[PDB]
Amino acid sequence: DVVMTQTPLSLPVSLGNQASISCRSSQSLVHSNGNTYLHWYLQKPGQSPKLLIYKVSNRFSGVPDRFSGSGSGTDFTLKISRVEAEDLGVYFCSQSTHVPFTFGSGTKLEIKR
Amino acid sequence: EVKLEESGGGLVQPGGSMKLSCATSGFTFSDAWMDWVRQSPEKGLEWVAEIRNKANNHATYYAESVKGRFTISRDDSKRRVYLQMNTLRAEDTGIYYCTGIYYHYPWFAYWGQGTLVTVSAEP
Ligand SMILES: CN(C)c1cccc2c(S(=O)(=O)NCCCC[C@H](N)C(=O)O)cccc12
Prior knowledge:
Helices cover 0% and strands 48% of the residues of chain A. Chain A is mainly beta and 113 residues long.
């Protein structure tokens, strides 16, 4: 299976800061049809995952523009211009280019207490 | 509005059996490929099984770790997906979520809130 890796495991930030999350794949996520099926989800405590960005940089319905995604091949990055409370939780990257679909271990975006 | 809701979770002993259900609404069900994805601190999020649409004759696919013990099925008439888990193991413990994809949109766009499955013989 394609191994997905995220760093950092934890990203403590103060509201209003900038945030950058890294995700890497064991092999290129470029599909034979040309597309790159790498997606980002956000999961709040006790809640289920919510799709935030699909196909590297496309924001899913309702997702604010403070969220943006980039990368290509085996290296990607999710960024938040200025973190807000509703953005706190665990971020997971996932690829659906190769079956079975696999997920990264997750990055916990938390308040710097 | 897309709605997905799992039910059936509970605490079971190793080697036990349990059936999960997922009620859905808000999207065309018959052409959707429905999936079950689980989550545990041990292995994080992991895809468990998928059942394609009628175009694929409801072809089923399973993670290697559950093949032969888990059976995914669906009732297109009721718009529900199911997961029969037999010969359960401790490592099967986790929150089970119902979600799915469409052939042209291979991403888990919507997830149910989940149902908790605990396989343990002692607290
Ligand atoms: C629950 N699953 C399979 C899904 C439900 C709704 C939308 C999904 C998407 S999407 O990228 O948000 N929709 C694009 C086309 C969907 C049109 C469909 N005939 C409908 O009834 O909404 C992607 C993956 C799974 C979705």
